[PDB]
Amino acid sequence: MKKEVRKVRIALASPEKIRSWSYGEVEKPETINYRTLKPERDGLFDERIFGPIKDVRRYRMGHIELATPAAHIWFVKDVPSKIGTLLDLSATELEQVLYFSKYIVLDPKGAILNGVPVEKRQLLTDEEYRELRYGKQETYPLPPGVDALVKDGEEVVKGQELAPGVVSRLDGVALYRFPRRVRVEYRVQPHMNVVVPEGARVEAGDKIVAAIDPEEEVIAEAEGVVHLHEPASILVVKARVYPFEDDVEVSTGDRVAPGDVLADGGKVKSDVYGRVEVDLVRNVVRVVESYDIDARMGAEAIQQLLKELDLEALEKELLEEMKHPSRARRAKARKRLEVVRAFLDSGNRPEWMILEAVPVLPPDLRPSDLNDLYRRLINRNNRLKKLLAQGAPEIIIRNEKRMLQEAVDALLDNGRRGAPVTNPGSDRPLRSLTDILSGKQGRFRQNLLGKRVDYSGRSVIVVGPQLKLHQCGLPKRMALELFKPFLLKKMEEKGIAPNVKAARRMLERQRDIKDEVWDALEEVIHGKVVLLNRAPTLHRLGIQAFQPVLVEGQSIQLHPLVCEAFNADFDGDQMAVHVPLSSFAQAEARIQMLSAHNLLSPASGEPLAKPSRDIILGLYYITQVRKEKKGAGLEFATPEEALAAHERGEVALNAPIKVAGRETSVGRLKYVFANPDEALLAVAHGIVDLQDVVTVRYMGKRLETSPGRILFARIVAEAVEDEKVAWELIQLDVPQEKNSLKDLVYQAFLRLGMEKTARLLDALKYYGFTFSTTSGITIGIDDAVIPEEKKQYLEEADRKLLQIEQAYEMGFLTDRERYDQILQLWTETTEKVTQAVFKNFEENYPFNPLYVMAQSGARGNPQQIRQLCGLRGLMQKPSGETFEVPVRSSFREGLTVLEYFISSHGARKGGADTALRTADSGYLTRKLVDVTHEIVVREADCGTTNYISVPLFQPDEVTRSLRLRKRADIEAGLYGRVLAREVEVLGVRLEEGRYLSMDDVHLLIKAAEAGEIQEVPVRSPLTCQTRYGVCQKCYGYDLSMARPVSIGEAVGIVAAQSIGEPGTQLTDITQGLPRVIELFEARRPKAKAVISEIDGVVRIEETEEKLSVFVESEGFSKEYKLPKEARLLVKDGDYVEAGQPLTRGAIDPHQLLEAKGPEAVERYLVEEIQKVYRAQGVKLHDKHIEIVVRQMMKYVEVTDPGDSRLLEGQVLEKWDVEALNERLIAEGKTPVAWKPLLMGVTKSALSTKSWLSAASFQNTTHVLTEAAIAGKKDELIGLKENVILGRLIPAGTGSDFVRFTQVVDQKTLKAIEEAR
DNA sequence: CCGCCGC
RNA sequence: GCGGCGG
Ligand SMILES: [Mg+2]
Ligand SMILES: [Zn+2]
């Protein structure tokens, strides 16, 4: 029935749906009422609209029905106005003009021009809209007793002086009201009225003007004409004049258009649209330029526009505009077409971009900030409803819509336009909905950045020698609290307590609880495990799971071998501990997370459970053999009187129990041990020391090895029961060094299994330690022995220094030469003394404490040893130039005053370096994670076989000469890989797909030595077909384990980690972290080296303030300008492939991508990256640098369209889907030509397809804005995005591959058949 | 990087 | 957010 949430979708909200999720409508602004905490009704906190205040309430919504529309600030103020782009109004300036309603908008038709044709959609000032839209008859009053220079309705021109002090502003028709005077070529009082029109012809019998007094009223005479001159005032009308001779039309006030009849039948017709004024004072019909029109205001004006905009229409319109016009206008349309598409495409239409119904967030979600703003809206939205039914005066209506539109923006996003402040008290912007979603600590960034855990604890860690990697020492007292609930129950299970509350009080104040509470706890923890965490959590091993074994005190006992995993020593470091609550959590915790199960490092296939100093120390001292004094003749190799004599000479004081006597030193002649045990007992009785050379009969051979060695054999053969397989993997021919053991571990892992190895580790751990204590090794000032030759070599070098001095005091050597030669003097002299001290220990004190420590993988480093016994000699000055004088002393002897001071400089520079390099906070582990945090393993052997050939030989360093890449590096590229195609090499058939093990990579190397293979066909992430993910055959052998990678493993992570941790130690040409940042980030490095874009041969032109390297061949040469200060190493003559270093130093990815191609950029990056870690000791598998780098080119540009336009940057694979189904399923081969794009790691992240993820880093506004328009459906895949859901991650156990697995019992299975 | 201690 | 220490 109910279904797992697999897809999430963001779409626009229909006002109908707003009512849909809605429960009641908040109708009033009453926050809190004192009388009863009980909510005051129908404001915000009412319970019907949201729900019951007592014991699903904070899950319902209410809506406020806005009077006149307002809009979403999110869709209007985002950089690219989603509405401004779509509608085509000024994208950023025009909107604001009418969004609040101050300015006007236009509709169906205007035929008249203010000066230009009618504006289909534009807006004009109210004065001008009123002037011609509704017409504009404009008056011009006149001073009393003043005559005019224009008649009744005489045509007037704009700017003319109607009188001395008055002038007109418009052309059209100038109306005159009254004749205070009239001229008559052959004065009218208030009650007088002119019967005669404009300059009308007159006759004698014709009354002109009349009034009340029939007596003395204007009476015509002999041919008079009319010229009226004294108008009280003149009102000008924006109208045309149409004189008529006979009749007229409908009436004065009606509307007319061009053509419509005015008078005299169909003779005098109108020419413009306008109102009618049938004036008979001039016997003419003026049609004022005033026809109706329509237009609305503010959020309302766009609401209309949006509703009519027929996407389809503009879609087609843009289609034409797009591919036909020059790049200047086509580009604008293109960006405009996507939006249009998005809407139509997804369906959910754009008209909703307007707010008419503001959805109210639930009452329990917000217990204050947002409420103050909600009240504002409510108020104005309400004050407005009232201001509409009471009386609607315009100026107020608008002024109100404004404020309203402002408020609606507040609750959504404050600041975009001014900032709202709670009245006097704090000039602080009230946190609006947007502010609550973005920012460093917002809500989208909340689900990811982290938080504190229940069932946690932390304490100081202490070493627990006896403890096995399996377990961990945890303080009972801590466990008590940690496992409190689990304990309570078990308490009732056992009579200790009657109920839970009782068990609790029982632990509330009581001091011990003795054995019984303890018996219970220790019982509850039985097989459960907890996790442990170390300070900076760098790699997956930063947290391991252990079985807790309760202990006394405060500290937490940790296993020694895991001390390497978590960078953790015992000088006070503290670790945190957690508890897996779910039986599922517990499972994974102890299965795939326990310590003993994660032996190998995800970084390199090398072990991480490597025995450390102490263990090694012990193990070595016990396997070493001794050599003494050869008093004489060592020939028993043949004489029998040599067995007897040399054996009695031994009984004497002449021949030692360990003499250089080829076949056998008397030491072997004397003691011959049958059974293996036989040997050790003799030891235990004092006959033989462990380190003595004796003879011993083993399974099938008479072996000449010491007790110690043999004992070691047993220990291992005991750790793992298969005794034969034991000696098959150990070498008792040399003392056990950190490496001989390293390799033993690794071998054991591959050979006997995981857990069995764990057993051996503990084994070694135990013995190593014991033997360590009894061996009797300690340091004493005399233990640091100074070589007798030191006094020699220093003297030899000293005199030698005088020669160099006398040589300059003569003038032979330059000031510089002097210096360089002296350094050389010491640089060699010091190295001389180095091997000397060691030579003295090797020959005279084989068992020197200081020495033995160093040799054995235990502790100490050759370079250090030298600072004790030999001498630390060259310490550099402040800047960098090393000192001229060396530090002649050793630490054994008193390091002198100055020598110390001088040495100081270096120690300080090193400290500074460790600072800024440490605090970088695994910055790279951060960015790496950002671009690989979505990579996971879900598959079925991806079918696409496009492989990467791993090179077995390295080019030039000394010059052109093919070499065999170092053992290390070759491993790095081939270990745990899967062969793309089969390859017969030295007699063996290495099938296809086979995952080449270490041995198999040794083979290939040994073969390259002979000369049978130069490259290697192998599967890799760099060429995986699975869009989002990588499959089994492509990733490879590496796992925490050694067998092939299990599908469902968070490789993205794992790779990011393995690359980040190391970054902590990477502090002309420039490198280190910066080279790593420069490399992951496609950039133009300091020392750029001009790559050759054309592949031909080379030729130069010497000197001349500039040199020039020219790649020329068929007909053209790509000119390369190499500054007079550049270092070029390709010479006048031979060939140069595309993207080959023409200059010396670093290279620029972009260029190299263009010239050579992608398969080269990738391989460049990978290797150029490794280059730094390699030189820093770090050994990480190429796999990981690959996974990352691949993502750096998962996007490509478009040059030949089919669906979307060609200026886009979209996911590479998403195009392999389009092209595949455009040629395959649906015909019409519209090839989608693209261009591979090398985006930077950071930008790859930035623009990562899923919106959820974007909402996290960049800007939450833009991200959601765009994802809004195109109803985006976030296909839930990737750790980040799915983290927010709070759902099980798509990786790990969440792996779609196994998240669904069923367990049954043959009893219930046949039982389902019983149901059938 | 995480943990604490204090205006 | 400022200062001090620890890994
Ligand atoms: Mg430490
Ligand atoms: Zn693949």
PDB file of C-alpha atoms in Angstrom, chain A residues 114-314:
ATOM      1  CA  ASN A 114       1.247  60.567 -28.417  1.00  0.00           C
ATOM      2  CA  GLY A 115       3.971  60.898 -31.012  1.00  0.00           C
ATOM      3  CA  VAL A 116       4.511  57.217 -31.872  1.00  0.00           C
ATOM      4  CA  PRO A 117       1.996  54.419 -32.639  1.00  0.00           C
ATOM      5  CA  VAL A 118      -0.130  52.784 -29.889  1.00  0.00           C
ATOM      6  CA  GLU A 119       1.725  50.851 -27.128  1.00  0.00           C
ATOM      7  CA  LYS A 120       0.378  47.300 -27.157  1.00  0.00           C
ATOM      8  CA  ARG A 121       1.452  46.639 -23.593  1.00  0.00           C
ATOM      9  CA  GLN A 122       3.503  49.636 -22.445  1.00  0.00           C
ATOM     10  CA  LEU A 123       2.485  52.177 -19.816  1.00  0.00           C
ATOM     11  CA  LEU A 124       2.120  55.960 -19.839  1.00  0.00           C
ATOM     12  CA  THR A 125       1.744  58.709 -17.251  1.00  0.00           C
ATOM     13  CA  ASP A 126      -1.801  59.180 -15.951  1.00  0.00           C
ATOM     14  CA  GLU A 127      -1.841  62.774 -17.173  1.00  0.00           C
ATOM     15  CA  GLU A 128      -1.163  61.573 -20.722  1.00  0.00           C
ATOM     16  CA  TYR A 129      -3.369  58.494 -20.413  1.00  0.00           C
ATOM     17  CA  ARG A 130      -6.211  60.785 -19.250  1.00  0.00           C
ATOM     18  CA  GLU A 131      -5.255  63.290 -21.964  1.00  0.00           C
ATOM     19  CA  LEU A 132      -5.812  61.087 -25.032  1.00  0.00           C
ATOM     20  CA  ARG A 133      -7.138  57.786 -23.677  1.00  0.00           C
ATOM     21  CA  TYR A 134     -10.223  59.475 -22.194  1.00  0.00           C
ATOM     22  CA  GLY A 135      -9.513  62.630 -24.174  1.00  0.00           C
ATOM     23  CA  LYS A 136      -8.123  65.912 -22.845  1.00  0.00           C
ATOM     24  CA  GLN A 137     -10.052  69.124 -23.144  1.00  0.00           C
ATOM     25  CA  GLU A 138      -7.596  71.509 -21.432  1.00  0.00           C
ATOM     26  CA  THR A 139      -8.547  74.957 -20.179  1.00  0.00           C
ATOM     27  CA  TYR A 140      -6.671  78.194 -20.105  1.00  0.00           C
ATOM     28  CA  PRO A 141      -8.305  80.954 -18.041  1.00  0.00           C
ATOM     29  CA  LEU A 142      -8.037  84.605 -19.098  1.00  0.00           C
ATOM     30  CA  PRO A 143      -7.577  87.865 -17.113  1.00  0.00           C
ATOM     31  CA  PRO A 144     -10.681  90.084 -16.929  1.00  0.00           C
ATOM     32  CA  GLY A 145     -11.173  92.818 -19.513  1.00  0.00           C
ATOM     33  CA  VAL A 146      -8.797  91.080 -21.932  1.00  0.00           C
ATOM     34  CA  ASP A 147      -9.573  90.115 -25.533  1.00  0.00           C
ATOM     35  CA  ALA A 148      -8.297  86.991 -27.289  1.00  0.00           C
ATOM     36  CA  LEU A 149      -6.559  86.542 -30.632  1.00  0.00           C
ATOM     37  CA  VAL A 150      -8.550  83.406 -31.472  1.00  0.00           C
ATOM     38  CA  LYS A 151     -12.244  82.780 -32.137  1.00  0.00           C
ATOM     39  CA  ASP A 152     -14.939  80.438 -30.754  1.00  0.00           C
ATOM     40  CA  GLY A 153     -13.303  77.245 -31.971  1.00  0.00           C
ATOM     41  CA  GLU A 154     -10.608  78.683 -34.260  1.00  0.00           C
ATOM     42  CA  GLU A 155      -7.790  76.213 -35.011  1.00  0.00           C
ATOM     43  CA  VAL A 156      -4.935  76.977 -32.659  1.00  0.00           C
ATOM     44  CA  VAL A 157      -1.260  76.135 -32.573  1.00  0.00           C
ATOM     45  CA  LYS A 158       0.725  75.034 -29.523  1.00  0.00           C
ATOM     46  CA  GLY A 159       2.839  77.836 -28.100  1.00  0.00           C
ATOM     47  CA  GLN A 160       0.988  80.799 -29.579  1.00  0.00           C
ATOM     48  CA  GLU A 161       0.184  83.701 -27.255  1.00  0.00           C
ATOM     49  CA  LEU A 162      -3.595  83.575 -26.728  1.00  0.00           C
ATOM     50  CA  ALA A 163      -3.051  87.000 -25.198  1.00  0.00           C
ATOM     51  CA  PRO A 164      -0.153  89.139 -23.871  1.00  0.00           C
ATOM     52  CA  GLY A 165       0.135  87.056 -20.703  1.00  0.00           C
ATOM     53  CA  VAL A 166      -1.384  83.742 -21.799  1.00  0.00           C
ATOM     54  CA  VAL A 167      -0.043  81.125 -24.189  1.00  0.00           C
ATOM     55  CA  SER A 168      -1.335  77.709 -25.175  1.00  0.00           C
ATOM     56  CA  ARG A 169       0.273  74.301 -24.808  1.00  0.00           C
ATOM     57  CA  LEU A 170      -1.678  72.442 -27.461  1.00  0.00           C
ATOM     58  CA  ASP A 171      -2.794  72.361 -31.078  1.00  0.00           C
ATOM     59  CA  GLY A 172      -6.231  71.119 -32.083  1.00  0.00           C
ATOM     60  CA  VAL A 173      -9.119  73.483 -31.470  1.00  0.00           C
ATOM     61  CA  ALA A 174      -9.325  76.479 -29.131  1.00  0.00           C
ATOM     62  CA  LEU A 175     -12.791  77.031 -27.635  1.00  0.00           C
ATOM     63  CA  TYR A 176     -14.037  80.499 -26.703  1.00  0.00           C
ATOM     64  CA  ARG A 177     -16.871  80.936 -24.251  1.00  0.00           C
ATOM     65  CA  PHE A 178     -18.123  84.528 -24.368  1.00  0.00           C
ATOM     66  CA  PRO A 179     -17.853  87.710 -26.481  1.00  0.00           C
ATOM     67  CA  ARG A 180     -17.075  90.642 -24.174  1.00  0.00           C
ATOM     68  CA  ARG A 181     -16.560  92.383 -27.540  1.00  0.00           C
ATOM     69  CA  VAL A 182     -17.232  91.888 -31.288  1.00  0.00           C
ATOM     70  CA  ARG A 183     -15.858  93.691 -34.372  1.00  0.00           C
ATOM     71  CA  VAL A 184     -18.028  94.334 -37.417  1.00  0.00           C
ATOM     72  CA  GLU A 185     -16.615  95.601 -40.696  1.00  0.00           C
ATOM     73  CA  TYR A 186     -19.295  96.978 -43.068  1.00  0.00           C
ATOM     74  CA  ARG A 187     -19.990  94.746 -26.535  1.00  0.00           C
ATOM     75  CA  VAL A 188     -21.904  91.675 -25.377  1.00  0.00           C
ATOM     76  CA  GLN A 189     -22.987  91.778 -21.718  1.00  0.00           C
ATOM     77  CA  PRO A 190     -23.605  88.816 -19.366  1.00  0.00           C
ATOM     78  CA  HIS A 191     -27.214  88.399 -20.535  1.00  0.00           C
ATOM     79  CA  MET A 192     -26.321  88.891 -24.256  1.00  0.00           C
ATOM     80  CA  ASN A 193     -25.964  85.962 -26.759  1.00  0.00           C
ATOM     81  CA  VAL A 194     -24.317  85.826 -30.202  1.00  0.00           C
ATOM     82  CA  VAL A 195     -26.639  84.165 -32.775  1.00  0.00           C
ATOM     83  CA  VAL A 196     -23.892  84.537 -35.430  1.00  0.00           C
ATOM     84  CA  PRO A 197     -20.885  82.100 -35.743  1.00  0.00           C
ATOM     85  CA  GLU A 198     -17.224  82.535 -36.897  1.00  0.00           C
ATOM     86  CA  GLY A 199     -16.872  85.646 -39.091  1.00  0.00           C
ATOM     87  CA  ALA A 200     -20.261  84.906 -40.655  1.00  0.00           C
ATOM     88  CA  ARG A 201     -21.481  86.858 -43.661  1.00  0.00           C
ATOM     89  CA  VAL A 202     -24.290  89.207 -42.679  1.00  0.00           C
ATOM     90  CA  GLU A 203     -27.245  91.076 -44.304  1.00  0.00           C
ATOM     91  CA  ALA A 204     -29.202  94.154 -43.085  1.00  0.00           C
ATOM     92  CA  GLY A 205     -32.314  92.306 -42.022  1.00  0.00           C
ATOM     93  CA  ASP A 206     -30.548  89.886 -39.744  1.00  0.00           C
ATOM     94  CA  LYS A 207     -30.431  90.021 -35.978  1.00  0.00           C
ATOM     95  CA  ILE A 208     -26.930  89.061 -34.756  1.00  0.00           C
ATOM     96  CA  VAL A 209     -26.763  88.967 -30.942  1.00  0.00           C
ATOM     97  CA  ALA A 210     -29.705  89.167 -28.429  1.00  0.00           C
ATOM     98  CA  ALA A 211     -30.252  89.347 -24.609  1.00  0.00           C
ATOM     99  CA  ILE A 212     -33.041  90.005 -22.027  1.00  0.00           C
ATOM    100  CA  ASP A 213     -33.766  93.693 -23.045  1.00  0.00           C
ATOM    101  CA  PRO A 214     -35.459  93.454 -26.548  1.00  0.00           C
ATOM    102  CA  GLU A 215     -34.377  97.157 -26.610  1.00  0.00           C
ATOM    103  CA  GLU A 216     -31.036  98.011 -28.236  1.00  0.00           C
ATOM    104  CA  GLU A 217     -29.803  94.489 -29.031  1.00  0.00           C
ATOM    105  CA  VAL A 218     -27.286  93.630 -31.731  1.00  0.00           C
ATOM    106  CA  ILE A 219     -29.056  94.431 -35.070  1.00  0.00           C
ATOM    107  CA  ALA A 220     -27.358  93.631 -38.395  1.00  0.00           C
ATOM    108  CA  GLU A 221     -26.823  96.182 -41.204  1.00  0.00           C
ATOM    109  CA  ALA A 222     -25.301  96.751 -44.696  1.00  0.00           C
ATOM    110  CA  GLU A 223     -22.964  93.793 -45.340  1.00  0.00           C
ATOM    111  CA  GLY A 224     -21.367  93.180 -41.973  1.00  0.00           C
ATOM    112  CA  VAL A 225     -18.816  90.540 -41.127  1.00  0.00           C
ATOM    113  CA  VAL A 226     -18.025  89.007 -37.768  1.00  0.00           C
ATOM    114  CA  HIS A 227     -14.808  89.106 -35.679  1.00  0.00           C
ATOM    115  CA  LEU A 228     -15.343  88.186 -32.058  1.00  0.00           C
ATOM    116  CA  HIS A 229     -12.509  89.395 -29.850  1.00  0.00           C
ATOM    117  CA  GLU A 230     -13.243  89.319 -26.128  1.00  0.00           C
ATOM    118  CA  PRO A 231     -13.584  85.745 -24.688  1.00  0.00           C
ATOM    119  CA  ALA A 232     -13.656  85.373 -20.934  1.00  0.00           C
ATOM    120  CA  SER A 233     -11.395  82.379 -21.404  1.00  0.00           C
ATOM    121  CA  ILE A 234     -10.450  79.661 -23.867  1.00  0.00           C
ATOM    122  CA  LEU A 235     -10.566  75.907 -23.341  1.00  0.00           C
ATOM    123  CA  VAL A 236      -8.453  73.911 -25.741  1.00  0.00           C
ATOM    124  CA  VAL A 237      -9.553  70.447 -26.832  1.00  0.00           C
ATOM    125  CA  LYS A 238      -7.466  67.649 -28.339  1.00  0.00           C
ATOM    126  CA  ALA A 239      -9.893  67.320 -31.224  1.00  0.00           C
ATOM    127  CA  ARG A 240     -10.168  67.677 -34.979  1.00  0.00           C
ATOM    128  CA  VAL A 241     -12.700  69.998 -36.682  1.00  0.00           C
ATOM    129  CA  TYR A 242     -15.397  68.787 -39.110  1.00  0.00           C
ATOM    130  CA  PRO A 243     -17.634  71.598 -40.513  1.00  0.00           C
ATOM    131  CA  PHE A 244     -21.026  70.458 -41.768  1.00  0.00           C
ATOM    132  CA  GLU A 245     -23.458  71.963 -44.301  1.00  0.00           C
ATOM    133  CA  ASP A 246     -26.834  70.166 -43.759  1.00  0.00           C
ATOM    134  CA  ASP A 247     -27.606  67.647 -40.920  1.00  0.00           C
ATOM    135  CA  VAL A 248     -25.940  65.597 -38.146  1.00  0.00           C
ATOM    136  CA  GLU A 249     -25.569  62.228 -36.267  1.00  0.00           C
ATOM    137  CA  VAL A 250     -26.629  60.417 -33.049  1.00  0.00           C
ATOM    138  CA  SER A 251     -25.684  63.013 -30.430  1.00  0.00           C
ATOM    139  CA  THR A 252     -23.105  64.886 -28.358  1.00  0.00           C
ATOM    140  CA  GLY A 253     -21.265  62.438 -26.059  1.00  0.00           C
ATOM    141  CA  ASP A 254     -21.311  59.342 -28.244  1.00  0.00           C
ATOM    142  CA  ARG A 255     -18.100  57.620 -29.447  1.00  0.00           C
ATOM    143  CA  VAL A 256     -16.779  57.583 -33.019  1.00  0.00           C
ATOM    144  CA  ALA A 257     -14.028  55.954 -35.124  1.00  0.00           C
ATOM    145  CA  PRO A 258     -12.373  56.788 -38.477  1.00  0.00           C
ATOM    146  CA  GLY A 259     -14.991  56.654 -41.204  1.00  0.00           C
ATOM    147  CA  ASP A 260     -18.147  56.829 -39.139  1.00  0.00           C
ATOM    148  CA  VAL A 261     -20.679  59.401 -40.364  1.00  0.00           C
ATOM    149  CA  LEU A 262     -20.884  62.744 -38.533  1.00  0.00           C
ATOM    150  CA  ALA A 263     -23.169  64.992 -40.592  1.00  0.00           C
ATOM    151  CA  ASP A 264     -24.518  65.795 -44.084  1.00  0.00           C
ATOM    152  CA  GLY A 265     -25.412  62.165 -44.737  1.00  0.00           C
ATOM    153  CA  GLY A 266     -22.221  60.278 -45.515  1.00  0.00           C
ATOM    154  CA  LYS A 267     -20.262  63.340 -46.578  1.00  0.00           C
ATOM    155  CA  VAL A 268     -18.488  64.590 -43.439  1.00  0.00           C
ATOM    156  CA  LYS A 269     -16.982  61.551 -41.728  1.00  0.00           C
ATOM    157  CA  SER A 270     -14.597  61.364 -38.760  1.00  0.00           C
ATOM    158  CA  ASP A 271     -10.877  60.657 -39.188  1.00  0.00           C
ATOM    159  CA  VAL A 272      -9.845  59.710 -35.656  1.00  0.00           C
ATOM    160  CA  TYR A 273     -11.357  57.845 -32.694  1.00  0.00           C
ATOM    161  CA  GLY A 274     -13.183  60.198 -30.337  1.00  0.00           C
ATOM    162  CA  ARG A 275     -16.077  61.622 -28.345  1.00  0.00           C
ATOM    163  CA  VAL A 276     -18.733  63.798 -30.007  1.00  0.00           C
ATOM    164  CA  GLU A 277     -19.569  67.470 -29.433  1.00  0.00           C
ATOM    165  CA  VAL A 278     -22.293  68.630 -31.837  1.00  0.00           C
ATOM    166  CA  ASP A 279     -21.648  72.369 -31.424  1.00  0.00           C
ATOM    167  CA  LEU A 280     -24.086  74.621 -33.259  1.00  0.00           C
ATOM    168  CA  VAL A 281     -22.361  77.829 -32.109  1.00  0.00           C
ATOM    169  CA  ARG A 282     -19.980  77.296 -35.058  1.00  0.00           C
ATOM    170  CA  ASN A 283     -22.120  74.866 -37.001  1.00  0.00           C
ATOM    171  CA  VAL A 284     -19.333  72.285 -36.818  1.00  0.00           C
ATOM    172  CA  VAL A 285     -18.785  68.841 -35.229  1.00  0.00           C
ATOM    173  CA  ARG A 286     -15.558  68.394 -33.240  1.00  0.00           C
ATOM    174  CA  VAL A 287     -14.595  64.825 -32.399  1.00  0.00           C
ATOM    175  CA  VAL A 288     -12.250  64.941 -29.398  1.00  0.00           C
ATOM    176  CA  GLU A 289      -9.355  62.489 -29.673  1.00  0.00           C
ATOM    177  CA  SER A 290     -10.841  60.366 -26.914  1.00  0.00           C
ATOM    178  CA  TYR A 291     -11.924  56.791 -27.572  1.00  0.00           C
ATOM    179  CA  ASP A 292     -12.182  54.212 -24.836  1.00  0.00           C
ATOM    180  CA  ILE A 293      -9.263  52.008 -23.852  1.00  0.00           C
ATOM    181  CA  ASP A 294      -8.379  49.557 -21.130  1.00  0.00           C
ATOM    182  CA  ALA A 295      -5.499  49.184 -18.709  1.00  0.00           C
ATOM    183  CA  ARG A 296      -5.050  48.180 -15.060  1.00  0.00           C
ATOM    184  CA  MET A 297      -2.456  48.646 -12.320  1.00  0.00           C
ATOM    185  CA  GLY A 298       0.376  46.981 -10.344  1.00  0.00           C
ATOM    186  CA  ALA A 299       0.509  43.299  -9.458  1.00  0.00           C
ATOM    187  CA  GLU A 300      -2.865  43.346 -11.170  1.00  0.00           C
ATOM    188  CA  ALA A 301      -1.409  44.487 -14.550  1.00  0.00           C
ATOM    189  CA  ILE A 302       1.044  41.629 -14.694  1.00  0.00           C
ATOM    190  CA  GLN A 303      -1.596  39.140 -13.552  1.00  0.00           C
ATOM    191  CA  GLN A 304      -3.499  40.036 -16.690  1.00  0.00           C
ATOM    192  CA  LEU A 305      -0.473  39.849 -18.946  1.00  0.00           C
ATOM    193  CA  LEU A 306       0.559  36.467 -17.572  1.00  0.00           C
ATOM    194  CA  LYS A 307      -2.942  35.057 -18.128  1.00  0.00           C
ATOM    195  CA  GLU A 308      -3.045  36.081 -21.818  1.00  0.00           C
ATOM    196  CA  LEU A 309       0.564  35.314 -22.754  1.00  0.00           C
ATOM    197  CA  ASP A 310       0.084  32.346 -25.028  1.00  0.00           C
ATOM    198  CA  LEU A 311       3.331  30.545 -24.325  1.00  0.00           C
ATOM    199  CA  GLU A 312       2.968  28.511 -27.534  1.00  0.00           C
ATOM    200  CA  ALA A 313       2.829  31.743 -29.555  1.00  0.00           C
ATOM    201  CA  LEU A 314       5.908  33.279 -28.018  1.00  0.00           C
TER     202      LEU A 314
END
